[PDB]
């Protein structure tokens, strides 16, 4: 079988050996020729020039990307690169996997981890478990915030449960806060539960302000999505103990297993397309000639990328570019400032550790 090039890009320390181990158990129509690449930087230029150099020095059919940062921008950079070059990119760990709402129309970028809408519903399930029916929402303008608010609103307005959405705050973190605008907005909060949609960096500032006006102590419980907790080994000091987060940052699904599944997805999808059309998309020889060769390129390979099953496991992606059925882990920031497993979301069912929340 012919070989297709797959670049696996790793940012930050990682056991390359352990990663090469979890991986040629392919008897498909095509076999992967993978290439581990180390990267030290995660700025726009570094990421672009690196992937472009790979694409020009070799024939890359797809990219598997993983980083150890809390930088959600990385996902947005990858989507741009993916759409422009029409190359499949899987963000499987780190900032690369942090929700990227409204991917490009031509994007072939897929992320491991929950969609925004799924996290929103997981949160409502948590609140239902403990009969926390009265709450407010705080988001920034971070892309996806509308999907988050809409999802919540759609769910609670279509249920006979006595949900009471008191307030929805929209914080503008693109301007400075010298006029104490965000402080004045937060002072409006009264709910005992607060859902916060934003980035990790934004959360640390918002919590600092929220603390100053006494909204983080006892009586107030904040619930944030995966990307706010991000790397759970890095816990900002402004984060309030008692913070609850839906998470997917490498609890039961290790990096090695992810890299192996990433390679599988890309390889299977190419095999499936080859077996049906007798051709696969030719690897782009460069990024610097995409404007010419666009009538000759297409995101055709997407329809196969989203429907792969491997070793009897459904690795399907949504058309929005998210994982379909991720086993989510509910985590709590405890007294020792450590993130702590306190529930699991599996088979569209919530299984919490505690019946009554112990004191944090």
């Amino acid at each position: 079988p012919p070989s297709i090039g797959i670049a696996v890009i790793l940012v930050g320390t990682s056991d390359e050996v352990a990663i090469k181990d979890a991986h040629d158990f392919h008897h498909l129509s095509v076999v992967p020729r993978v290439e581990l690449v180390a990267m030290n930087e995660t700025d726009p230029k570094s990421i672009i020039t690196r992937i472009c150099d790979l694409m020009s020095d070799r024939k890359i059919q797809g990219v598997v990307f993983a980083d150890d940062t809390d930088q959600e921008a990385i996902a947005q950079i990858l989507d741009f690169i993916s759409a422009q070059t029409l190359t499949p990119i899987l963000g499987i760990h780190g900032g690369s996997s942090m929700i990227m709402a409204d991917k490009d129309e031509s994007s072939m970028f897929f992320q491991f981890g929950p969609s925004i809408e799924q996290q929103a519903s997981v949160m409502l399930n948590i609140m239902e478990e403990y009969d926390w029916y009265i709450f407010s929402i705080v988001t920034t303008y971070f892309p996806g915030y509308q999907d988050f608010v809409n999802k919540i609103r759609s769910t609670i307005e279509n249920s006979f449960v006595g949900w009471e959405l008191e307030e929805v705050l929209l914080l503008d973190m693109s301007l400075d806060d010298g006029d104490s605008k965000i402080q004045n907005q937060l002072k409006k909060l009264q709910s005992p539960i607060i859902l916060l949609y934003c980035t990790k960096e934004e959360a640390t500032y918002i919590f600092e302000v929220a603390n100053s006006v006494g909204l983080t102590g006892y009586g107030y419980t904040w619930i944030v999505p995966s990307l706010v907790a991000g790397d759970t080994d890095t816990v900002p000091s402004e984060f309030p103990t008692g913070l609850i987060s839906v998470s997917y940052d490498e609890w039961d699904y290790g990096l090695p297993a992810r890299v192996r599944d990433g390679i599988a997805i890309i390889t299977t999808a190419a095999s499936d397309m080859l077996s049906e059309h007798s051709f696969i998309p030719e690897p782009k020889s460069s990024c610097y000639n995409t404007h010419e060769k666009r009538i000759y390129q297409s995101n055709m390979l997407n329809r196969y990328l989203i429907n792969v099953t491997f070793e009897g496991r459904d690795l399907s992606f949504s058309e929005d570019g998210y994982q379909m059925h991720p086993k989510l882990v509910i985590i709590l920031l405890n007294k020792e400032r450590k993130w702590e497993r306190v529930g699991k979301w599996k088979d569209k069912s919530l299984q919490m550790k505690y019946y009554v929340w112990p004191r944090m």
């Binding site: 930087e41 230029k45 672009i48 741009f80 693109s174 301007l175 400075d176 404007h291």
Partner: protein, 358 residues
């Protein structure tokens, strides 16, 4: 020796680069620049998005630009890659001639002002016309894309915040033959029709409206600029009224006004304490420019009254306010200016309006 503060620009031609240089030179002559002195750094548009993004890093951000002017090239090449790369660091981008409404979305373009208004703001002019000519019942037809919906939202805000829209009709972009949609409009009693659509989509509407005899006497057609441009103008019904943003395509004029605004904002910025420098280059830098958000606020609230393109202010989306429009009326298949929106007021000239039919 003063502190040199670089201003960036991505412009159409070398001629415009030189205009940008001279504009910055004049700002330095005009202002007190013992402490702070501007320096111009510019390139022209690269052939594709990725190259453009890289150039922003290599040519501009490497010079520690505090802001970046961007023109819309007239030749598929948008300011978007520049908005993205600059936005990564919270370095403000000033659009010179981009009209698409999507650049008003803070989620996508989180440090983007422009000295021209988005197409959607043409609703402001429509509204004043509805007051003036007392069109208290209108039918709104818009393309079911971002731009079409943007115009609908803006007009509905004005109407809900007097005249009323008796109905709103959305059609799928790229639909030739819109008989079904237009028949629905025909039934209604209102006969003032407002259209937001691309060139090609407006053409389809116009043709279909003609076959349904909805372009004759009794009807009023009020549209924007795209809708009386190119091929849309070729099939537009006589008597139609449209708009043309004055100086809307004059890159030179907007470079002048943008530089003046940015220079004024920079001198105002350095009146405050604890101003940090933007990152030098992209490589190895992933943190935002800490002073970026402050500088954005300063720009947002900038006022430049004696601008080449008129009074310069920005709204809460960083879009141009007090924009000036030519009110055009197709008479005998010739576009004729029948007045202007001077930024806040409609001014009818001595040329008489000829409506559809009459």
């Amino acid at each position: 020796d003063p502190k040199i503060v670089n201003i960036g620009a991505v412009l159409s031609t070398k001629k415009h680069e030189q205009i940008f240089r001279e504009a910055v030179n004049q700002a330095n002559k005009r202002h007190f620049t013992r402490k702070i002195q501007l320096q111009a750094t510019s390139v022209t548009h690269r052939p594709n998005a990725i190259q453009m993004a890289l150039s922003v890093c290599e040519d501009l951000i490497s010079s520690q630009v505090y802001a970046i002017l961007v023109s819309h090239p007239p030749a598929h090449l948008t300011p978007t890659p520049i908005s993205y790369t600059a936005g990564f660091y919270r370095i403000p981008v000033i659009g010179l001639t981009t009209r698409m409404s999507i650049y008003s979305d803070k989620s996508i373009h989180l440090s983007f002002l422009r000295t021209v208004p988005p197409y959607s703001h043409q609703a402001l002019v429509w509204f004043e016309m509805m007051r003036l000519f007392n069109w208290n019942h209108v039918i709104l037809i818009v393309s079911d894309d971002h731009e079409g919906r943007a115009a609908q939202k803006k007009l509905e805000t004005l109407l809900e915040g007097g005249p009323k829209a008796d109905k709103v009709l959305q059609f799928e972009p790229g639909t030739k033959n819109l008989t079904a949609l237009l028949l629905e409009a025909k039934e209604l009693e209102a006969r003032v029709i407002i259209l937001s659509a691309s060139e090609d989509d407006a053409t389809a509407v116009y043709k279909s409206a003609a076959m349904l005899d909805m372009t004759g006497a009794g009807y009023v057609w009020l549209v924007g600029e795209r809708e009386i441009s190119g091929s849309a103008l070729r099939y537009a019904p006589d008597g139609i009224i449209g708009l043309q943003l004055i100086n809307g395509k004059n890159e030179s004029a907007h470079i002048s006004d943008a530089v003046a605004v940015v220079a004024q904002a920079i001198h105002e910025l350095f009146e405050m304490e604890n101003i940090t420098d933007p990152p030098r280059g992209c490589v190895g830098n992933t943190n935002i420019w800490k002073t970026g958000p402050l500088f954005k606020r300063v720009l947002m609230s900038s006022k430049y009254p004696d601008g080449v393109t008129g009074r310069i202010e920005f709204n809460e989306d960083g879009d141009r306010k007090f924009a000036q429009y030519s009110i055009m009326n197709l008479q005998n298949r010739k576009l004729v200016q029948v007045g202007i929106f001077n930024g806040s007021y409609i001014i009818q000239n001595d040329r008489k309006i000829i409506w559809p039919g009459g």
